[model samples]
Target: QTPMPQFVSKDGKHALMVDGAPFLILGAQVNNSSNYPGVMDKVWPAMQVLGPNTVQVPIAWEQVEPEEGKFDFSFVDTLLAQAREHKVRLVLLWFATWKNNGPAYAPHWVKTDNQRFPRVVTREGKAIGSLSPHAQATLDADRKAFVAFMQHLKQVDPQHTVIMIQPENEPGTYGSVRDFSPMAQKLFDGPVPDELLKRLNKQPGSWAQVFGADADEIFHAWSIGRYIDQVAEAGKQAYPLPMYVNAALRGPFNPGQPGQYASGGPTDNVLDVWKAAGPHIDLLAPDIYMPEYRMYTTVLERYARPDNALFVAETGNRPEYARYLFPTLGHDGVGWSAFGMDYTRYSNYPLGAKHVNEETLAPFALGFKLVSLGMRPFAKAASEGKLHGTAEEPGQAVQELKLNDRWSATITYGVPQFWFKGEPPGNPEPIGAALIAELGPDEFLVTGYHVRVTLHPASEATANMLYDRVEEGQYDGDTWQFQRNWNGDQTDYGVNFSSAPQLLKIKLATYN
Candidate 1:
C-alpha cells in the first residue's frame, strides 16, 4: 500500500485525509531560498504572522544528491525536526529536475551532461534550460534519486510529518510549446500515442492531425505527464505521500497562448492528456498568479472535476489576493496557500510595521489564523453539501450565491467598506468574500471579510428574515464556541464585515 494519508471520495466529493479525517491546509509557502537551515530562524516569525497549520518548502535535487548516486538524508532529517518543533505539517516541494518550467534545480552533473540527459530543443536546434522529455537516461536518473528520497521518508516519517510531495514545480518549457528536436519531430510526425489517443477520444493520427493547432502543446503535456508518472511510480514503490504537480498557469485559463506560457505542464485544455499519462499522480493543481477573478474561478472549475480535487497551490502574496481564500473554502478545496510568508518581507499592517506596506497580510490574518481550527470542519461540511461560498469580483461589485434551492445569500463587496474605527483600511483593494452554510432547517453559519451578507428567499419561496439567535462564534474542533450575540444595529440592515473576519450562526425565520 502507498500510505495511510490519502484522498477518499464520498458522496462524489474528495477529501485529503490525514490521521483518518479530512484535513484543510491553512498553508503558506516559504520563499525559494528560505529552506536553508541557516535561515530557518526567520520562519518562526512568519509562522506567527501567518498562523498556518502547514508550511510548504522545497527539497532540491542539488541539495539531496550533489554528487550522482550519493544521497544525503541529513537535510530531510533536520527539516522533519524543525517542522516538529514548530508544530506545523509539511508539503515538500520536489525541486528535482524541474522548477518553474526549467531544470535549474537539477544537480550540476545532470545539467552539464546534456548529451546523456538532453535539454529541450527549439526549432532552430538550440537548447533551452528545460529538460527533454524523450531522454530515458534523464528519466531513469531522476527516478533513482527520487526513490532514495522517498525511501528515506518511509524510514523517518511514520508520524506523517510530511503530508504530501510535489513531484516537480510548474513543469513546462518557457520559450517553446514543444521540443522541436529530431527525436521530438519524429514522435510528433508519428501517429499519436495510443495512451493519449484513447484518453482524448481520438483515432490513430499525427499530433497535428488529431489536435490541429493544439497538437504541439498537447503532445508536450503528454510526454511530460508520462515522464512524471514513471517518476511517481518509482517513488510510490518506496513510500507514497500523495504526490501532485503544480502548473505555471497562463491567461485564458485552459490553454494559455502557445510559446508564451510554460508549454508541457498541465494547463486546463490538456488536462485530460496529463491525466491519461500520469495516473500515479494524485492531482494537477493551479498556481494562480494572475489576479483576474474569472481566470481563478475558471481554473478552479476546470480542475475540481470528478477525477481531481481543487487546491490553490500558489497565489500572489498581496492583501487583495486574500479575498480569493473565500472562494477556495467554498470550492471544497483541499488546500489554499500564498507565496512568501516571512518576516524579511515588509508588511504594511499595524499602521507602520513595514518599510513598504505589505497589505497581503489581511487574508493571512483570516485564511491562516482565524480559519485554521475550522478547515477540517469546513471540509466535512462542504463535502456534506452544507457550505457554499461567494467572492468579490472586481469586474462586478454585488453578487448573489444560492446557498441551496430554498435560500439565497446576496453578498455586497467592494468600495467604502465598514470598518470599526481602529480597524480602518490600509490596502483599499476589494478582498471581499463570504461563506454561508446551512447548519439546521432554519439556521445558518455565515461570515466574511471586506463584505456584507444578506439573506433572501429562493425562487418560488417567500420568507421574511430576522435574527432568531445571532451569536458571534468560531469553530474550535467540531464545536462552535460563542463570543457575543447580535442585537441593536448589528441585526439591522446587513451583516457588516470589515478586515477582521467573524463567524455567525443566524437562526432565520419565515411566515406569511
Candidate 2:
C-alpha cells in the first residue's frame, strides 16, 4: 500500500492534517505492558473513556524480533486490528535502542551476545546496559528492524489509521556524558568528525571553539541523533510516515544538565544541533515534568518555530497539569498528553493514583469531547486570524469576553511573575502565562487558567446571553436519556458586566 498523504496545517504550522482537515491531536500514551493484546482489554476501555482521537502505543524491538533474522508481527497485527475496530488513530512508539534511558527493551539475544551487539562501556571500561551509538552493528540492527516494522505497517494498515511514528523511546544515554568504551573513547578524543563540524560550522580551534563550550553534550547528541537518523531513513524507505524524536528535557537553557540520573539528554539550545545531525527526524518534542509554567512555555516556544510543530509528548502524571492543556492547545498547533496513563495503580503519590482512579479519565473525556466539537470553528477562526487566548498566572487578572463597543470591564489581580513589567520592557519574563484564540465577527470560545471575564453590549440593544450546560447522557436502546443539565442559562444583559471567572460556557446573540 502507498503511504498516506502527510499534511501540515493550512497555515503551514506543524499540526497533523487528516482528510485535508487540520487535526489537533487529543491523545494518550499507553503503558509499555498494555501494548499486548491480553493487557489491552483493560487499557483500551480506559483509553476509550478518555476520548482521545489518537492512542500512542509501543512497538518493542525485542517483541518484534526475538532472534536474528526472525520477525514476529502478531502483536502489531492485533493492535492495528483493535485500533481500527474502535475507529481511533494511532502513533506507534518504536521502543528500540532506548526505553526511558535504558536498553532493556532490546531483544535478550542482543543483550546476551554483547560480542556482536556490544553495550557502551564507561571510562573505566565497565559495561553499561545501554548500547553504544558508535557501534555499527547496533545501528544496523535498529535500522533493519525499524524498516521491517514499517514494511509490516504498510502491508497491513491500508486505511492509514496509523498516522505517525516515534523513532526511538527517549533516545539518550544515561549515567554518563559519552560512552567510555574503547571505540567511544577513540572517537571522542579524536578531532571531531568533519561532517559534524561542518554541520555545526565549527571554526579552527579546540573542542570548545569548534563545538562550543558544551562540547561533551554536543558530541553525545550527535551520536544518539545519528543513530535514530539511520532508523528513520530505513522506515522512510518502506513507508515514510511523519516521524519525530522525543527529548528527556533538562532545565530551560541548561545544556547537558540532565545530571547523573540521565546524562546525554537533549537540552534546549542543542535542538538545532540535533536537527542538523538528524535531518530525517521531523520534530524534537519535549516530555515535561516541571511545574514552572514559564519554564515549560519557554521550552515549548523555543522548539515551536515555523520549521517545527509543537507537541508535548508527556507531562507529569498529575491532574493539575491537565488544566494546562487548555493553554497548550491554544498555542499554535500544540498537542499535549500526560504520561503513565496506566501507572496510576502503581504510583507513589496519592493524587497520582487519584487522577487515574477517579478524576483523570472523566475530566479528560469531557474536555476532549468539548475540544472535538469546537476544533472546526477553532481552526477556521485561526486560519482567518480571529483566534485569541491567554494563560492565567497566580494573582494576576485575566479577562476574556465578547462585548459590544460600549461595554467595558476591569480585572483586578496581582502581577504574575512572567509578564512584562516597567517601561519599554526587557524580553518577556522567563516566567509567565499566555492567552490565545480565534474570534469571528460575532462568535468566540476561550479556555485557560485563573482569570476573570465579563460580557456586555456597547449600545442600548439587549443581547440574549446563554450558557449551555454540558449534558452527560446515555443511549438507551433507540433513544437517549435525559441526564442532568449542567446549569444552562440565557440572560439579557443591558450594558453591564457579568460575574467573575470560573469554569463555564457562555453563548451570546443580539435580537432586534
Candidate 3:
C-alpha cells in the first residue's frame, strides 16, 4: 500500500516522504493565469523541456466554484490525469480570498458581494481590496470552499498524485497594516491572546501594551494566521495531505514597515505569531523574489527552523537563481520551485528573467537533472545532517566546506581546469554551485555545475595528502555504476564539473 505524503523530521532535519521513502521536489510553477484548460496547451511542453519532478499549479476559487454552493472540479480532474500522464507529482495552489494580498482570485460571487464577505477596513475608515480576516462570514465561505477542494482530492486522487496543498497565495493586506473595523478594534483592545503570549513568552496585556510599536502588524498577523489555520484545519479533516502557506517576503534585514510590505504575511518577524496561530498548517514558506545572495541566504536561515522544514515555495526562474538549489538542499529543504515556467508568454521580469523559454530554462534544467540523478542519496544525506553546499556569491570565488575537524573541501569557481592556478577569478556571471556529502572521516560525495572542488587536510600534521581513490560514476537505483578512475589530470587540478552532469566519490589518505 502506498503511504500518504507527509513531512517528517529527525534530529532537526526534515524530509518529504513519498511512497514511503524520502523525496525531493525539483519543481516548477506555471504562470498565475495558466490554471484553466484553454491555457494548458502552453504548459506541458515547457514542463517536458524543464523536466521537473513536481509541478506547482493553481486551482483558483473562481474556476472551482463560479456559483456559490455549486462546486465544479472539472479542471482539477483534468489536471490530475494530465499530471499522471506526464509522470509528475502535483502541489495544488488554492488561489482564493487571498492571491498576492488581494481577492483577485475569489469568485465573482465572493469578490463582488462584499456585504456578506467584508474587506479589511483601513485606519482611515476605508475598506480596501483585501478580504477581512476578522469577518466570520468571510472565513466560513473560504473554509467551505477549501474543504470541498480537499474532499474532492480525497475522492479522485486515491493513487496520491497530489502530494501537497497550498491554502492561499501570499495572504495579508497591502494598503493597511490591519483592519480598523470596529470589530477588529474591539478585538485589538482586548488582552493579547493567551496562546500567542505564551508562544512569545510575554505577559498578559492589550495588543498595544504587549507588543508596543509592533502592535498593529502583530494583531493583523494573528488574525490572518488564525483565519488560514481554520481553513487548513477543516480541509485536513477531509483529507490530510501536507499543507503549507506561501509568503510575499518582507526584506530580511531592513524590512521598512508593516504597511510597506505585505503586512501580516509570514515575514521573519511574525513567524512565531503564525506558528502559534496556525497549528494546522504544516509550514510557512517564503516566495523569494529577492536576487541578492546575502538577502537570499538570510531568508533561508530564518525559515529553516526545527519546527518548520525549509521549502522554497517559489523563486525566480533566472539562470543565476538555479544555483541556489545547492544551498537550499543542504539546508534540508523539502522542495524548491521556480515561478513563471510555462510557455504562456508571461514574464515577471525584473523579478525573474526577461524571457521564459528554453534558453532561460537551460540552467534550471541542468540543476534539476543533477538532483533527479541522485535524489535518493541526496535526500538521505540531507536528512542525516551529512550534506553541505554553497553557491558562488559576488566577489567570492573560493569557499571552504568544513566537513570535520580533520578535513575540508576547497571550492573554486570559474577557474581553468588546465595548468592555470593561484587565486581563482569568480564565475563570469556567478552561476556556480557545489555540494558535499560526507561518507566517512575522509571520504565524500561531490558534484556541482561550473565548479571545481579539492579535498584538503585540516590539521597541519597531515600536510602530505593524496587521493586514495576517485571513482567517477552515476547512481543506478541506489547502486553506484562506476565508469573510470580520475587519477592524473582530473585529480591534479581538482575535480572539475562543467555544464554536464557528474558525480564523484573521492577517498582521501595521508602517506607516512
lDDT of 3 by residue, 1-512 (tens): 88999878766878788888878888999999999888888999999989999999999999988999999999999999999999899999999989989999999999998898899998889998899999988889999999999999999999899999999999989899999999899999999989999999999999999999999999999999999999999999999998999888764432422323679888888999999999999899987777789988988899999888889999888787898888988887787898899998887776678888888789999988887777778777777777788899989999988888778889999998766847788988899999888878888888899988988889997689989989888787577788888988888888999988778888888999
Candidates in order, TM-scores: namely: 0.89, 0.78, 0.96
Who is ahead in TM-score, 1 or 2? Answer: 1
Worst 10 residues of 2 by lDDT: 493-502
Angstrom error of the Cα, residue 491, model 1: value is: 1.7
- Measured by TM-score, how close is model 3 to the native structure? 0.96
lDDT tens string, model 1, 1-512? 33468866655587888777778777888778877788887777667667778889989998899999889878789989988988899999889778887777899999898889888989888999899988889899889999999999989989898888899888899878899999889989988888887887798889899999888889899899989999999999999778889987775552422323678888887889888999899888988765667877877788777777778898767655676777887777587887777765544233123321234455566756546545666767666656677677765667888776667777876434333434323224656788776777667777777777877778556466556788887777778788999877776647777756577878876665
Q: How many backbone clashes does candidate 1 have?
A: 3
What is the number of backbone collisions in each predicted candidate, taken in the order shown?
A: 3, 19, 0
Best-matching candidate per TM-score: 3
- Let me know the TM-score candidate 1 reaches against the reference structure: 0.89
What is the descending TM-score order? Answer: 3, 1, 2
Per-residue CA lDDT of model 2 for 88-193, tens digit only, reads: 7888999988887677888887777789987777777777767788889888888899999999999998888888899887777676777877787666666766
